[PDB]
Design a protein around this ligand. Sequence first.
Ligand SMILES: [Zn+2]
Ligand SMILES: [Zn+2]
Ligand SMILES: [Zn+2]
Ligand SMILES: [Zn+2]
Lengths: 348, 348
Amino acid sequence: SSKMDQLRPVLGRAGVDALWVSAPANVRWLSGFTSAEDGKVLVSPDGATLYTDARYTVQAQEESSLPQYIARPPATYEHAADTVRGLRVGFEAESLTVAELEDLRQAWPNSTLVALRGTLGGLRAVKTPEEIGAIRAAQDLADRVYTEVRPMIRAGVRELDVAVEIETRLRRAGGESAFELIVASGPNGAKPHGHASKRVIEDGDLVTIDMGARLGGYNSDMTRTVAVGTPSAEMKRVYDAVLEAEEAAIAAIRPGVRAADLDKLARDLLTRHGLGEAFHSLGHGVGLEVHEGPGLRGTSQDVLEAGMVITIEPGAYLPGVGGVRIEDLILVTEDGYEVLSHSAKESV
Amino acid sequence: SSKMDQLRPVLGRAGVDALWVSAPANVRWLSGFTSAEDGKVLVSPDGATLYTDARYTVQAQEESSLPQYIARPPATYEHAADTVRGLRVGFEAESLTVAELEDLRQAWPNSTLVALRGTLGGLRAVKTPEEIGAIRAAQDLADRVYTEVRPMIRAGVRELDVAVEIETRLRRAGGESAFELIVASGPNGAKPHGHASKRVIEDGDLVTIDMGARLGGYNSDMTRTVAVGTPSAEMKRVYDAVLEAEEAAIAAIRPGVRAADLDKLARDLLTRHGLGEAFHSLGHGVGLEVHEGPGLRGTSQDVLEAGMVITIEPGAYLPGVGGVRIEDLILVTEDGYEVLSHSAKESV
Ligand SMILES: [Zn+2]
Ligand SMILES: [Zn+2]
Ligand SMILES: [Zn+2]
Ligand SMILES: [Zn+2]
């Protein structure tokens, strides 16, 4: 199935005739345009057009699989107006600002603007072989940088300096850090989104490193926890249980498995090991964004299929004491899975 | 004048009784909360309240000058509903997503939601002595890092590696790069927003370095152009004219000067030196955001006053050949100006 043929049935079930595409990830997904913050796409009964300005004329001609209309707003959607006369036009209500919607409403007085909220969640969940290649390249960069920086994670080093070393190397390679880096040591490990602080790593700490590369527009995401010196018996028990949970959830990945059931497997296991209040979401899709569909929460209705790329990231957090998360990036295959993130997972 | 007493007359002239504050910069400006992406503020006839969730209970108690209501959405604006019954409630239409507006409309069925578009532009233009202190600290960091990295800007070095060296040092100091770094060498100097590429700097190039630090939530912004070796006679003429324009526009800064008239001074001067098609905006306010009010375009109606912090950044760009921009960060004083960015401006 082409990407447009994935989208149009969704729009039909949403009760709209057209879609104004404003989320940069979906502009790029549909058209191939890589400066998508400055493009928009109109999907309509007449076909699909990329709108961008004359700074991008050559780039858009080289990249876009869609015909182009070159202008700045508001000429872009005034030119579009004829195409959407009398139509129900969906828009991405979680992306579009009210001011932008007002502009469209003024431009399209004979259309009905229809808010789509979660409607396109998971639109991009199944990746093509080309997209998987770009995700592999990003994760391979992240693994290389993690391997290079790992020896530097020792007593006396600040969390922040570890983060600087990772960022430095990702940038020099032509990528960048995919999200604000987490290097969470000692009691900072109890913070699931504890961005690298000035705390000095000390003997006896666990250190949680959550990192990804964005490279060529595609993202990776992994987490490792390592010991500096000898951790407490309690923190070793926590680490072992989190690793056990991660390995069990990964081992259930296959087409047709329910995301919510993966979450249940991990929470039952953590509960069995005394951490039934310590762990939230088990993971998320990764692609043009770090966090995208599917979602691995207990309430999720998502169902995995081959070609999706997700994370599995159980964690347990003891406030004031410590915490552990271990996370891998997984490709769903036709009869199981492939782990894309290859950095070592150590004993503690 | 307190910040709230700057805001309320604006709201009165906008025809609203209250304001739902969603832009992180304005949440922080009004309340002092530093994790403002996860706070919101309701300004109303009853006073003003910061809304944030229980992850931030202690932080918000320590930081906020405003009473707090602790909950997640949608409890936050359902709790707010009683306060806005029968009122015209403004919201920030350039910040708020349509989905967020729909949520407010459902929560506040007996209020009238009123879109404010450019209404709050320049709300934060006049800085307090405390805010000026934070901007000085950010620019002082940027100047230190620029001085450290300057010798590394030589033939054989990639644009990207210069950017990495700046970023590395800003991060290790506890700040970060304020915006995607521009290191634009040779023909890349014709690109006003040419992010640092893999191009190798060579003898005979000019190199334009546009950088800022974000530190403690406040931003800086400057640009220097330097010669590596001997530039062409033409590129030297361009450099000298841009410096002349920057120094003339800066010298006109004072309370009461019109932003548009500063722009005219710079464009007339560039025109007199043969660059009347080569140069756009002359500059912008800087504070909690890199680009904020006032605006120094030919159409601007802004009028400078003491305590504003702006940039002056004339440039001339020759596609396929080269380009020059020179930019300084300026405090408006009671009878003139003070240049906050102190890095050397060199001859070429
Ligand atoms: Zn993740
Ligand atoms: Zn992660
Ligand atoms: Zn600037
Ligand atoms: Zn600048």
